[PDB]
Design a protein around this ligand. Structure first.
Ligand code: HEM
Lengths: 498, 498, 498, 499
C-alpha cells in the first residue's frame, strides 16, 4: 500500500521493541481502567468521582479551534531554502548573505474558499505560504499560484470573500453574488481569466508555480532601495487536471493534494522550486505605464527579466498535522532587515489583518508555538504576561524602556528606508484604472486556440446560473476586453439558457 | 429557478419601495466611502486614521467560531409540535398537558464525521436534534436516525470519533483505525449493519426516521415512574439513495440535504413526523432478557408496541444560518419536570459533555442567545456576571440564596424521583454482554435477500482497504453473528484483495 | 443609614406585593431543591445527575472577565448632555445641532494604576470617560482630570505603565522603576507637578475637573476645519484631600468615591460639569511657539479663551455594576461627522489600542452590549457572524459591497477632511522638545508658597525610596525647571536619607 | 535596603559583564527604533507600516487574564517536602514511599475575598495550596489556615461568596448580605468564631498553620482503606496582628505578606511546616458521634492523635510572578494512587469546580504550562489537539483506545477502592445537624477570657452595620451556642446602635 495508509503500522515498527507506555491523565496520574466508568452497581448512575472520564471528555470537547477565515483547507511540509546566486547588491538580508547558505523553511498550500472538509481538486486559486527561519527572525512570504489578484483595494477583500462563500441564509454557494461582484468590479477580469484557464485546477501542489503577488522593497547596506517581485517556479513542470478528472477525484478522493504530497515526500521524490526576482528601480517605477504597485498588473519579463536567487526544496512531512499545519501562522509583517513593504495598499491591509486573526484564532502568544517560534533567533523585548505564556516570561528582567539596568537595547542599523511621498491625505479612487490591456494580451498571445475555447466554455458553464442582467454586464466587460471573447461567452450562455 | 437561488432577489422585492439604508460602522458612525482607503497621495502607504477599514477587517478576522467537534455539517428548520393523544398517566410535562397543545420547536439535522465543508450524501449516521420551547424551559431531544449506537460506555466515545475522523499525521481518513476499533469492540456490529444497509444514505432529511436512542424516565403527578423510548417516524416515507447516485450528488451538490429541505419548506411541502413512545415498567425492566438501559439494544415492538403522542412539523427556514443554526445548542440535561434521565451510562456522559463544549465554543452565556433562550419561560436564578452578559444581569436583586429579601425561591413540586440502587461503587465491565442475537434477528428476518447482498457488498468494499488481520477479526465477528454473513464478507474480501 | 446600605431593603420594598419568582436553571427548568445535592444515601458520593449543581458551579467558575489593563478600578453613572450655546460655525455634529438639545451620556471615573480591589483615595491621575449616544452613533470622549500627560509618543505608553505597576518578580510597587523612567524622560515633569500638587488626590469624582487632553479637529458644513481642545469643569468646586485624610480613608473606605457618587445621585444632589472648548486656527497652529499637537503642552487661556458649549449632568446610578460599568467600552475612534482626529501621535495610538483590548476582554461583538449599543442610531453594515452574535445578524441581506440588491449604501456627505502633509515618512525624535517653560510658569505663577512647599514635600517623600543616582537625575531635571525647586527637593531628600 | 527593592539592581549585577541584548519584535525581527513612531513628517499622522508599534500595543492590550473567582490576591514560593516517618501501612503513594525522600513542591498563599489589588492584612480566612511533583503525577493539597469551613453543602458555596463579595449594584461590601447568610445558616458559627479570633489576621503567611479541611481516603498495597485528615503546622510559631496594626499595615503596605515571605526566603530564613495526619478507621467512622465527613466538624486530638509524616520547607522565590504564581492551578482531583476522595460532599464539588475554572481562565491545555506540568512523570494519553497545544501533540501515535499498534495501555494496579453505599439516591438535608457543641467547646475551653472578650468585640464591631432583625437572629444563634456569648454580643450591639 501507499506509505500514508501504512503510517500507524510504521509507527508500530518503530516501537516494536519498546514496551507500551502507562496510560495517564492530563496531570500524569495513572489510570486504573479506561474502558469503563464508575457507577452505583451494574445498572446505576454515573458519579463525579470518575475524574479521568471528566478530564478526557472535557479535553475532547475542546479539540476544535476556529478555522481560518480563508484558506482553511491545506497541506503542510518542511524543508530548506538554498541560495544559488548573489543578490547582495539589492538586499542585505541574512538569507541572501552568501551563496550556499541553507535556511529552514515551513511551507503550507491551501485553497481559498474551501472549508475544512472541502475538496482539493476544485477550480480555485491556490495559496502558497512560506516561512523562513532566519537569524534575524521569521520571514513570511505569503503568495498564491497567481501573480495577481481580483481586487487592488484592501477594504473590498471581505466582501469579495463573502461573495465567494456561502449565502448567509441558505448556506449555499450563490453564483449570483460572485458574478455580481465581478461585473461591478471589472478589475478582476484579469484574474478571472487566470482562474478559468487550465491553471485553475492544478494536478497537485507539486505541479504549480508560486508567485509573490505584491511588490516589495529591497534595501542594501548602502541604503539604496529597489522594488522587487518574488517568483518561485516548480521544477517538476506544470500539470493540470481536466474538469471531468477533477470532479472524479473530488467524489473519490477530496484529499488528493495531501496524499500526493505526503507520498511524494515519503518516497524520496522531493518537490523543488526555483526562486526568481524581478527588480524595478524608482525611475522605472515613475516611468512605468501603469501603477507598479497595482496588484492587478504584472511586470513583463522582456522589460524586467527574471533574476535567479536560490531554490526551495521540501523534504519532511508533518509529524502532527494540527500542531505543525493547523496552528502555523504566516504574518507578512515579519520582514527582516533588507526587506520592506511597498505603498501597495493590499499589502498594507494584510500587514494588519493577518496578526489580528492569528491572535484571535490561535491566541495572543501564538508566536511562541514551536512551529511559529523563531528558534534560530533570540527574542528579547519588553512584552510581558499574556494568556498561556510559556517559557519564563523573560524572568525578572526590567519591563520598561528606556531603563538604566542593562536591559535590551535597540539596534540603529535596522532602521527603515525613508521616502518622500507627495499628495494630500484622502481616499483616492482606483476603480477606473486600466483593466483590459494586459487581459487582452493574455487572451491573444499567451493562450492558444484550444485554451481560449476551454476558457470560454468554463466561464459560460459557471456563469449560466447567474441572472440575466449579471450575464449582460459580464459579457459587456469581456467584450471590452476583446470582441470575440464576449461573443463566444454570449453564444454559450444563450445555448445554456435555451 | 429554485427559491434558494432567488433568495437575494426576493429580498430585493421586499425592499423595492424602501430606500437603501445608510452604511455605518459598528458604533453607528456613517461611512463616507467604503470602496477606497486613506493614503498619502495616490501611491502612498496606508494610515491608521482609516478607522472604518480597521473595524471591518477586525470583524472579518473574527467571523469564525470553533466548529462542533461532531455533527459539524448540518441544516436547520423551525416549526411546531402538536399533541394528538393523551399520555398524562405516564408524564406530567407541560408539553403533554392536553390534546391540541402546540409547542414551538427548532430542529437541526447533521452528519457525524463530516466537517463543515463535508458532503451530505455519504454513508454516515444522521443526527436529529429537536428543541421544544415549553413553559417549563427548553427540552432538548437529541437523537439520531438510528435507535442504537456503536458503543454503550461513554468513556470510549472520543476514541471512536478519533477512529472515524482523520489520521493525526496524514490528515486522511484511515479505514484501518475504524475497522480496528470495530473489531476490538464487537458491540458495534448491530449499528454497523444499520450503517451499511440502505438506510445509511437517506435521500434527504425528509425521508428518514428519527429515534431517541436512550431510554428516559417519565414521572406522573402521583410520583409513579416508567421508562420510555422516544421515536419519530417520517410521514413522507423512507427513501434511500444508491451508492452511485450518492457519489454523483456528492461531486455535484454537496449541499443536497440543505437545498432539498429549504426548497421543500419554501414551496409549502412541509415535512412531518409522527411521534411515538414505547413504555416499560420497572418489573418489565427487571425481567427484560437484556439490560434495558443498553444503548446497543432495542425494545421489540411486539412486546412493547408503539404508543402515539403527537406530531412534528417544520414550516420555517432560518433567516440567518449562523445565528439560528450554527449557534444553536442542544443540551440533553434540559429536561423539564415529568422527564428524567435513566441509569444508561451514555446518557449520563452526554449530560456533562454537551454543556461543556457549548460553553467552550459559543461562550459561558450561550443560553441567552435568542435561538437558545427560553423566551416562553421566566429565567430567575442567582447566576450573575459572565462574559458578554446581555439583558440587565437580573438588575440589583440579591445574589445569594437563602436570603430574606424576597428573591426567587425553589419549587418543591419539581423534585426528582428517588430510586434505591444496589451494588458497590466501582467500574463494571460491559464488553462481554450479548452482541449477536439482535444482529442475527435483523440480518435474518428484517432484511430480504437483496438488502443482505447489498449490505455484504458495501461492508466488503469499505473493509478491503484495511489490513489482513483486521479483516480476519471482523469476519470472525460476522461469523459469530451468522455463518453466511461472514462467508459472503470473506469471499468479497478475497475478490478485492486478489 | 445611607441609601447604598439600604439598597436590598429598597428592592424588598419595591417587590413587597409581588410574590417571589420560581427558581430556575439557565435553561428555565424549575429547581426542586437548591440547598442540597444528590448523593447515594446520607453519606454517599456526588452524582452527575445533579445538573442544576453543575450548571450553577460552571457559571460561577466563569463570572470573571479580564480586567482593564489600565483604569481597572472605577465608578459609573448615567445622565444627559445639554447644549447651552451655538458652535455650529465650528462643527456640524448632531450633538451641537441646536440649543437645548439633550443627548444621553454614560460616564465612568477611574484610577490609572489601581487594580480591581485598589483604593480610590490615592495619589494617581483620574480618568474621566464619557459616551454620548448621538443619532450619528456613539461619541467617546476619553480624557482625564489633567489636560496633559506624562509622555507624547504612544510607543512608550506600555513601558510607562509597566513602570507605574508592580515589579514582574516581587509583584510589589517599585519606586525605582517609576523615577528611573521619569528621570530618563523629563517631558513628564509637567504632569509630575500636576500629579504631586493638591489635585493629585481629589475629594471624590464630583469635585474634580475633566479635560480632553488631546487636540481634535472640528469641521463645519462648508468644510472649514479648526483644531480644538475640550474641557469640562465641575460646578461643585474643586476640593482636595490631605495626605493624612487620604490614608485614613484608604484604610477605612477604599470605595470612598463610589459611595460618595452613589449617595449623591440617590439623594438628588446631581453633580454637574460645564463644557468648554478652546479653538485654534491652522494659521495659529503654524505660528504657535510649541507643537500644538504635543500632549505635554497646553493652550494658554489668554491667547485661547474658553468658549462655553453645554453642560453635563449625571442623574442615574447603575442598576447592575458589571453590566453597565465593568463591560462598558470607550473607543476614541467613535467620532461622528464634524469631529475628526488630529496629527497628535498619542491619539493615533489610542485609536488602534482601545478597540483591540475591548475585543480581547469583552469579545469581538462588544459593541452590541446594551450599554455600548448605539440604540439611537441604525447600524447597517456588511459585518456578519462573530462569536455570540445576538440580534438577527442582519438577516439574509446581501453581505458583499458593492451589490445590485438594494443593500446599504455609503453616504458621501460623511467624508473626512483632506490636508496636505509635508516631510518624509520616517521616525522623528521628539524627546528634545521644550519641557521646562510651562512647568516653570506653573511652579512660579499658578502655585502659591504653601502649594509649592507641599509639592516639594510630597515629591521628596515619594522619591526618597529610589536609588541615589535616580535622585540626582530627578533633582537635575527639577533644577533645570527651576533652581529653588531642585534645591528644596535635594534638601528634603538629604533629610530623608540621613 | 531590603532585597526586594534591590531586585533590579541585583539583576544588573548578574549581567554586569554581559552586553545588552538586541531588541526584537515577537517574531525576532530587530527594532531600529522604539522611542518614536512613523509619521508623515514631524507633525503628521501615524502609519500602519509601524509594525513594531502595533505588535507591542496588541500584546500590551492582552496582558490581563481573568482573575481567580476566589483567592485572587496571593503570594507564591517553591521548595521541597521531606519524609521523616513511615506511613506505608496507611498509604502506598510514592511521596510516602520511604524515609528521606524529597519531593519538589510549589506553594501559594492567598486571601479569599480580596481582589487582585486587595490588602493582605485583613480579617479573612487564608488559603494554603500545595502542589507536589511526584513520579505518579501532581498531587494538589488545597487547604486553608482553618480545619473547617462555613458550609457543608457545595451548592451553597457560590451564594456564600456572593455574600462575602461586593453588592451587585453599588459594588460595595455589604455586611447585611454576610450576616443574613450566616444567620440563615448557623452551621457557619464554628468557622465564624475561628474567623473572629486572633487567628483571623495572621502576622504573615509564615506564622500561621495550614490544614487539609476535608477528610480523604488512604489505601495501602493490600487494599485496606482508612480515612485521614491532613495538617501542617508552622515551625516558626503562631503570631497574630492586632486590629490597629492590621489597619496601619493595610494603609501603609497592602503587600505585607508578599514582602515578608520574599525577604525571608532571600535572607535564608526559610519557613518550615511539620506535616501530620489523623487516621480514622471505618468502624470509628461508623461509631463517630457526628458525621466524620462533615467539613464543619473536627476530629479531637485525644481520640485521634496527630501522627507525624514529614516536613515542608520553602527555599525559592518566583522568578516571574505571573508565570509561576498567577498561572499556577491546583486541582484537588489530582490525587495519585494511594490517596482517594471521601464521600464528603464539598470535596466532590471541588473536584469538578476547580478544573473547569482553570480551563476557563488559563486555557484548555493549562496543565502543560511549566509550573503545572508534571515534569517528573511521563504523560501519555489519547488526548489530542486543543488551543495552544505545545510540545509535539504526542506525534503521530494512535489516537483511539483500544488499539492494536502498541499505544499506551492502562495499569490495573491503579484501580480505585470499592465501597458499598446504602440508601436511596435523592437529596438529603444536612442543615439540621449539630452546630453548637464543638463551638461551645471552643468558646469555653480553648479560648481564655481575653480571647473571648476580643472575639465578642470584633463580632459586635462587624455586626453593628447590619439591620436589626439580622442582629437578633445572629444573637439567637450565639445564645444557642452559649448564653454569655450572646449576651455580650447583644450588649456591645446595643452600645454601638445607641451611638
Ligand atoms: C487585503 C488583502 C487580503 C487580506 C485582508 C487577507 C486576509 C487573510 C486572512 C485573514 C487570512 C487567514 C490566515 C490565518 O487565519 O491563519 C489569510 C490567509 C492567506 N492569504 Fe490572504 N488576504 C488578502 C489577500 C491575499 C493575497 C493578495 C494573497 C497572495 C497573493 C493571499 C494569500 C493568502 C494565503 C496563502 C493564506 C494562507 C495562510 C496560511 O496558510 O496560514 N491573501 N489571508
Amino acid at each position: 500500500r501507499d506509505p500514508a495508509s501504512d503510517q500507524m503500522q510504521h509507527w508500530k515498527e518503530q516501537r516494536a521493541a519498546q514496551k507500551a507506555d502507562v496510560l495517564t491523565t492530563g496531570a500524569g496520574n495513572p489510570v486504573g481502567d479506561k474502558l469503563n466508568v464508575i457507577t452505583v452497581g451494574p445498572r446505576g448512575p454515573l458519579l463525579v468521582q470518575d475524574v479521568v472520564f471528566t478530564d478526557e471528555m472535557a479535553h475532547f470537547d475542546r479539540e476544535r479551534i476556529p478555522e481560518r477565515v480563508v484558506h482553511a483547507k491545506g497541506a503542510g511540509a518542511f524543508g530548506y531554502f538554498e541560495v544559488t546566486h548573489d543578490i547582495t547588491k539589492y538586499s542585505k538580508a541574512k538569507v541572501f548573505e552568501h551563496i550556499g547558505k541553507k535556511t529552514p523553511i515551513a511551507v503550507r498550500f491551501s485553497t481559498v474558499a474551501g472549508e475544512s472538509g472541502s475538496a482539493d481538486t476544485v477550480r480555485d486559486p491556490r495559496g502558497f505560504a512560506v516561512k523562513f527561519y532566519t537569524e534575524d527572525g521569521n520571514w513570511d512570504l505569503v503568495g498564491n499560484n497567481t501573480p495577481i489578484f481580483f481586487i487592488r483595494d484592501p477594504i473590498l477583500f471581505p466582501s469579495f470573500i463573502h461573495s465567494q462563500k456561502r449565502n448567509p441564509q441558505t448556506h449555499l454557494k450563490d453564483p449570483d453574488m460572485v458574478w455580481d461582484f465581478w461585473s461591478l468590479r471589472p478589475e478582476s477580469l484579469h484574474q478571472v481569466s487566470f482562474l478559468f484557464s487550465d491553471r485553475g485546477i492544478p494536478d497537485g501542489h507539486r505541479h504549480m508555480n508560486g508567485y509573490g503577488s505584491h511588490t516589495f522593497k529591497l534595501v542594501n547596506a548602502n541604503g539604496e532601495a529597489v522594488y522587487c517581485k518574488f517568483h518561485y517556479k516548480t521544477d517538476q513542470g506544470i500539470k493540470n487536471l481536466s474538469v471531468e478528472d477533477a470532479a472524479r477525484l473530488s467524489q473519490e478522493d477530496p484529499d488528493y493534494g495531501i496524499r500526493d504530497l505526503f507520498n511524494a515526500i515519503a518516497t524520496g521524490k522531493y518537490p523543488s522550486w526555483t526562486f526568481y526576482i524581478q527588480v524595478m528601480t524608482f525611475n522605472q517605477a515613475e516611468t512605468f505605464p501603469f501603477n507598479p504597485f497595482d496588484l492587478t498588473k504584472v511586470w513583463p519579463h522582456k522589460d524586467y527579466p527574471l533574476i535567479p536567487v536560490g531554490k526551495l526544496v521540501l523534504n519532511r512531512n508533518p509529524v502532527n498535522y494540527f500542531a505543525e499545519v493547523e496552528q502555523i501562522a504566516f504574518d507578512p509583517s515579519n520582514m527582516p532587515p533588507g526587506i520592506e513593504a511597498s505603498p501597495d495598499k493590499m499589502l498594507q491591509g494584510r500587514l494588519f489583518a493577518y496578526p489580528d486573526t492569528h491572535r484571535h484564532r490561535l491566541g495572543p502568544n501564538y508566536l511562541h508555538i514551536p512551529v511559529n517560534c523563531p528558534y534560530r533567533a533570540r527574542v528579547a523585548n519588553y512584552q510581558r504576561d499574556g494568556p498561556m505564556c510559556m517559557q519564563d516570561n523573560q524572568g525578572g528582567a526590567p519591563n520598561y524602556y528606556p531603563n538604566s539596568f542593562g536591559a535590551p537595547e535597540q539596534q540603529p542599523s535596522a532602521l527603515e528606508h525613508s521616502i518622500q511621498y507627495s499628495g494630500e491625505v484622502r481616499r483616492f479612487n482606483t476603480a477606473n484604472d486600466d483593466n483590459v490591456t494586459q487581459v487582452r494580451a493574455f487572451y491573444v498571445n499567451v493562450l492558444n486556440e484550444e485554451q481560449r475555447k476551454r476558457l470560454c466554455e468554463n466561464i459560460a458553464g459557471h456563469l449560466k446560473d447567474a441572472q440575466i442582467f449579471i450575464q449582460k454586464k459580464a459579457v459587456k466587460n469581456f467584450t471590452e476586453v476583446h470582441p470575440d471573447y464576449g461573443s463566444h461567452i454570449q453564444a454559450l450562455l444563450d445555448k445554456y439558457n435555451a
